[PDB]
Design a protein around this ligand. Structure first.
Ligand code: HEM
Ligand SMILES: *[C@@H]1O[C@H](CO)[C@@H](O[C@@H]2O[C@H](CO)[C@@H](O[C@@H]3O[C@H](CO)[C@@H](O)[C@H](O)[C@@H]3O)[C@H](O)[C@H]2NC(C)=O)[C@H](O)[C@H]1NC(C)=O
Ligand SMILES: *[C@@H]1O[C@H](CO)[C@@H](O[C@@H]2O[C@H](CO)[C@@H](O)[C@H](O)[C@H]2NC(C)=O)[C@H](O)[C@H]1NC(C)=O
Ligand SMILES: *[C@H]1O[C@H](CO)[C@@H](O)[C@H](O)[C@@H]1O[C@H]1O[C@H](CO)[C@@H](O)[C@H](O)[C@@H]1O
Ligand SMILES: *[C@@H]1O[C@H](CO)[C@@H](O)[C@H](O)[C@H]1NC(C)=O
Ligand SMILES: *[C@H]1O[C@H](CO)[C@@H](O)[C@H](O)[C@@H]1O
Ligand SMILES: *[C@H]1O[C@H](CO)[C@@H](O)[C@H](O)[C@@H]1O
Ligand SMILES: *[C@H]1O[C@H](CO)[C@@H](O)[C@H](O)[C@@H]1O
Ligand SMILES: *[C@H]1O[C@H](CO)[C@@H](O)[C@H](O)[C@@H]1O
Ligand SMILES: *[C@H]1O[C@H](CO)[C@@H](O)[C@H](O)[C@@H]1O
Ligand SMILES: *[C@H]1O[C@H](CO)[C@@H](O)[C@H](O)[C@@H]1O
Ligand SMILES: *[C@H]1O[C@H](CO)[C@@H](O)[C@H](O)[C@@H]1O
Ligand SMILES: *[C@H]1O[C@H](CO)[C@@H](O)[C@H](O)[C@@H]1O
Ligand SMILES: *[C@H]1O[C@H](CO)[C@@H](O)[C@H](O)[C@@H]1O
Ligand SMILES: [Br-]
Ligand SMILES: [Br-]
Ligand SMILES: [Br-]
Ligand SMILES: [Mn+2]
Length: 299
């Protein structure tokens, strides 16, 4: 928000306004990076981004400690080298390249279509990067009529997404990604669980309106009473939440789940790609921004 607005105070004392991405700006498949870029906490053009810039943006503006993004930074830079074909040092070339499929970006996302979702021909691909309201609605529908949800509900959400994606993706494309996805499940609990409840740290519940605002608008839900977690969330919270989602008993089982969908997930680890492997072409779509309604500087 505008620095003088005091909207972030006393949690964030140095805010910057929302500015919609323009057609030449680079955006990510990540609702967090996109929100940071929309505020200029990382470059508004989404290009040439250092590790420290990312660390500071997350810590100071989203209440997410450095430990939370350690693996994510490692993997961003692995993918950057894989896509561009050279080491990019400490300047991530852009955000868009993070949507390289079957890499850091993965199938069965909460709010994005899959790279080969619903394609008639094997060589076709679609936008697996921009926010897709229909896809997100498939996630929200699992918790329809609710204001909050818990670990078991999140487990049901990701299962519904896995089932839909396995059914809809071009045959042979779908690849389950429980470890990366459920770190992101933990990220959701870290950012938008309801810290106003007495047992938030032990038993976090996601506030659905906060989640929907963040994802749909790619800006921060201050108007709904959200603020950056204080103290900043650490990696222990995130992986604990990740484990808890996957440990939660399943009471409704969708058809068409891949093998071993239900049960514990492996620890997320650094990515690696063969030097002989050519990257898949990136979707070239202009960056998504909220248009119903469009957002003002304080939104
Ligand atoms: C350098 C730090 C980060 C990088 C490089 C990064 C990268 C990515 C990428 C490539 C995806 C796409 C995965 C997919 O859905 O296919 C993604 C998704 C996601 N990210 Fe980020 N991420 C970072 C930090 C964070 C943080 C700190 C949060 C929140 C605390 C966050 C929230 C999410 C969520 C919730 C998704 C899933 C979106 C969906 O499934 O629709 N990310 N991230
Ligand atoms: C973010 O950065 C990535 C990585 O550099 C950009 O994707 C790449 O964009 C270039 C065009 O600038 C593509 O190069 C072209 O490739 C075709 C086919 O190989 C070739 O015939 C052309 O002469 C040219 O070399 C490259 O394919 C593409 N990489 C991938 C894997 O898709 C991306 O455009 C950047 N996005 C933004 C919004 O800045
Ligand atoms: C995206 O952000 C906009 C702007 O903040 C939200 O629109 C506001 O919604 C609230 C409900 O909390 C209303 O009181 C305001 O009147 C709205 N303002 C405008 C300009 O319409 C919008 O709801 C957000 N989207 C989501 C899905 O959360
Ligand atoms: C991205 O741009 C490519 C050429 O630069 C196209 O060949 C791709 O199909 C893809 O097009 C989509 O996104 C662009 C954004 O530049 C739109 O202009 C297209 O209409 C399409 O949605
Ligand atoms: C914001 O400023 C107030 C007033 O000086 C201070 O009490 C608070 O600690 C600051 N918040 C942060 C996160 O630095
Ligand atoms: C989230 O984190 C837990 C604990 O490491 C994993 O088991 C899960 O697969 C996901 O990566
Ligand atoms: C989540 O999982 C990690 C290991 O993946 C632990 O290090 C952390 O304490 C938390 O339980
Ligand atoms: C790890 O931490 C999470 C979040 O604090 C808990 O909900 C979980 O029960 C475990 O203690
Ligand atoms: C990962 O951690 C969670 C939360 O502590 C457990 O519920 C799960 O059994 C696994 O050990
Ligand atoms: C875990 O526990 C739940 C209780 O709701 C059962 O529905 C499920 O079959 C699993 O055993
Ligand atoms: C078992 O409970 C889950 C949520 O924990 C529901 O989504 C499901 O329909 C069934 O009631
Ligand atoms: C219980 O919930 C699951 C996951 O949301 C559905 O796939 C199932 O049909 C039932 O409604
Ligand atoms: C739906 O069905 C699956 C497999 O039968 C169970 O693992 C799950 O607990 C739910 O009852
Ligand atoms: C987004 O942009 C539109 C431009 O017409 C405005 O109507 C809206 O108030 C917001 O600034
Ligand atoms: Br670029
Ligand atoms: Br489809
Ligand atoms: Br797994
Ligand atoms: Mn995806």
């Amino acid at each position: 928000q505008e620095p003088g607005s005091g909207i972030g105070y006393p949690y964030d004392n140095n805010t910057l306004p929302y500015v919609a991405p323009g057609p030449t700006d680079s955006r990510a498949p990540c609702p967090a990076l996109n929100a940071l870029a929309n505020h200029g906490y990382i470059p508004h053009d989404g290009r040439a981004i250092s590790r420290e810039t990312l660390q500071n943006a997350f810590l100071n503006h989203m209440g997410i400690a450095n430990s939370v993004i350690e693996l994510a930074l490692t993997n961003a830079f692995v993918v950057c080298e894989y896509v561009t074909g050279s080491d990019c040092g400490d300047s991530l070339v852009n955000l868009t390249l993070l949507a390289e499929p079957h890499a850091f970006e993965h199938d069965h996302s909460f709010s994005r279509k899959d790279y080969k979702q619903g394609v008639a021909n094997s060589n076709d691909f679609i936008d697996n990067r921009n926010f897709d309201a229909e896809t997100f609605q498939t996630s929200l529908d699992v918790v329809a009529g609710k204001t909050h949800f818990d670990y078991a509900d999140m487990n049901e959400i990701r299962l519904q997404r896995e089932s839909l994606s396995n059914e809809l993706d071009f045959p042979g494309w779908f690849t389950e990604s429980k470890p990366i996805q459920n770190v992101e499940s933990g990220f959701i609990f870290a950012l938008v669980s309801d810290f106003n409840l007495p047992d938030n740290d032990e038993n976090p519940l996601v506030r659905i309106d906060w989640w929907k605002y963040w994802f749909t608008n790619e800006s921060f839900p201050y108007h709904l009473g959200w603020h950056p977690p204080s103290p900043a969330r650490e990696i222990e919270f995130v992986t604990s939440a990740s484990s808890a989602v996957l440990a939660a008993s399943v009471t409704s089982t969708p058809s068409s789940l891949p093998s071993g969908a239900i049960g514990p997930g492996a620890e997320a680890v650094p990515l690696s790609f063969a030097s002989t492997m050519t990257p898949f072409l990136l979707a070239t779509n202009a960056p998504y921004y909220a248009q119903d309604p469009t957002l003002g500087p304080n939104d």
